[PDB]
């Protein structure tokens, strides 16, 4: 429901840095940056949105001067802001549906500073470093004008064009596929029944081990993992007493199955 | 204090079937030293030509990477995903459970 850009500046040593810029729409990725050519790489045909061919170049130039100036203030202020090698810097910025605009920064995995309204504000827990860092970021007022212009105006008018052009790819439906298998036994005289599911899109699913119409409540539903093609994966396990298990089944409900649940029946041989 | 150990998850896109091509996915999530050696192993040897996704982070600024490769499993071949990292005394090896 939100589109955000991330920036990952990793300073492994004094002469070793790697900054990665990527544009994401919630879970899937839609843009990438290439400092080798200093251009924005569109990952999908629709990923250009409803924006002009010209102002896209105006954005990629604004980005390249912003990423090059930013990625070099650090190691000039490394001693200044007491940054300890090695260290990491992370930034997230974007907007949501319908229209809150956010921008946050992280130093060494923790919340360091944030941008609110038209200024940089330190997190109270972050200490005095953030105040110093906020002051150096608050120095040049043109940048914070440019930043606030992006977050308030460009982000909503872009995400509207992006979601519209991605409608065929956002609400596309891919049917799942399931297979049962054996898992690591949870103890003595106990088996583990595993029900893998893969290939479904979107993420919303329903998976549970069954006994007729009685949902076996001891069903352990795992995390939803990607598969590098836009689909997902999920394994659900269940522990039984080496018996009274040959009558168990795994039922799958998804928005792509059109109301016909996938059902698989355990054999055990 | 701010050193997080990655979560390693191994899975296959399709059901295992000897002779048919498939995809093997290893998923490292939940770490913030942010520099790590993810390697897929086929019968012990390092698998080459392993493609990944572009690195990113989650809400708690914790890093996750997806590494995948295509392969044809056999009956005598066993595979694993080996991870080397700051927060690891020895490389952590996670095997692929095939029934």
């Amino acid at each position: 429901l939100s589109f955000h850009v991330i920036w990952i500046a990793s300073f492994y040593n004094h002469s070793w840095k790697q900054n990665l810029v990527s544009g994401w729409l919630s879970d899937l990725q839609t843009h990438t940056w290439d400092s080798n050519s200093s251009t924005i790489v569109f990952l999908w045909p629709w990923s250009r949105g409803n924006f002009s061919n010209e102002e896209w170049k105006e954005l990629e130039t604004l980005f390249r001067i912003r990423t090059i100036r930013s990625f070099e203030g650090i190691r000039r202020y490394a001693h200044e802001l007491q940054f300890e090698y090695p260290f990491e810097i992370q930034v997230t910025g974007g907007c949501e549906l319908h229209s809150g605009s956010f921008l946050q920064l992280a130093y060494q995995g923790s919340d360091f500073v944030s941008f609110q309204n038209n200024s940089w504000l330190p997190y109270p827990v972050a200490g005095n470093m953030a105040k110093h860092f906020c002051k150096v970021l608050n120095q040049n007022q043109h940048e914070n004008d440019i930043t606030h212009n992006l977050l308030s105006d460009t982000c909503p008018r872009f995400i509207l064009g992006l979601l519209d052009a991605g409608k065929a790819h956002l609400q596309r439906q891919v049917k799942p596929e399931a297979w049962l298998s054996h898992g690591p036994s949870p103890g003595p005289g106990h088996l583990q029944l595993v029900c893998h599911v893969s290939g479904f899109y979107p993420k919303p699913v329903w998976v549970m081990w069954m006994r007729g119409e009685q949902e076996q409540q001891g069903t352990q539903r795992g995390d939803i993992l990607p598969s590098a093609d836009g689909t997902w994966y999920l394994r659900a396990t269940l522990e039984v007493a080496a018996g009274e298990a040959a009558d168990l089944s795994c039922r799958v409900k998804h928005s792509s199955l059109e109301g016909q649940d996938i059902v698989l029946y355990w054999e055990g041989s | 204090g701010i050193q997080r150990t990655p979560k390693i998850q191994v899975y296959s896109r399709h059901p295992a079937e000897n002779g048919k091509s498939n995809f093997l996915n290893c998923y490292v999530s939940g770490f913030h030293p942010s520099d790590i050696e993810v390697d897929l192993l086929k019968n012990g040897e390092r698998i080459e030509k392993v493609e990944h996704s572009d690195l990113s982070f989650s809400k708690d600024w914790s890093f996750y990477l997806l590494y995948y490769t295509e392969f044809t499993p056999t009956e005598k071949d066993e595979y694993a995903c080996r991870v080397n990292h700051v927060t690891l005394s020895q490389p952590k090896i996670v095997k692929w459970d095939r029934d």
Partner: T-cell receptor
Amino acid sequence: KSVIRQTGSSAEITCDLAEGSTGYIHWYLHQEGKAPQRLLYYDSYTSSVVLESGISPGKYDTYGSTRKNLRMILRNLIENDSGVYYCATWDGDYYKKLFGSGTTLVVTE
Amino acid sequence: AQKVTQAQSSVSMPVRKAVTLNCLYETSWWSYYIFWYKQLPSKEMIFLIRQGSDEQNAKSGRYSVNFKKAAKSVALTISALQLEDSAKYFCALGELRWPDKLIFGKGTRVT
């Protein structure tokens, strides 16, 4: 190879490297009895001169715009910062860090 | 977060013999080389041998290394001793993935 200077003045050390297999170049200081440490490194691709740890900024500068003829100037000398000064750069393979000749610098009141 | 030191400061061995120089390192890295260098009395510095991490035992010509990665120790074993190779020696260490500065020992003078 040998430079003598008084306290408070300036000094420029010119170091030599075998042709140029040069990317980033590092400067090391060697004192007998102690251990050699790096003071600063020069990135020619952006003229970046960043110090290291608790080294006073501005005390050391480098501008040699040549692979083999490269200079480092250290200013406001004291009786302490006297010793051998090396220039080093890594190989193309990054397997071996090749060092220069070394200039002996002595400082007296 | 690394440290490298050497114990002995000055030693002497018979000509045409075998001698060693130990080095201790406390490192928090999983990929790194450690090298040995030769400081001539004329301040010239020369590379000798490169090893580290899981890279077997390096014997790149008339000189080997005793590698104890579990105990974090490396010893430069120089056999077929030459009277000519009588100088100072320094123990260095650096990162593998991101090669940068080296951390040296206090030196081992050889006569």
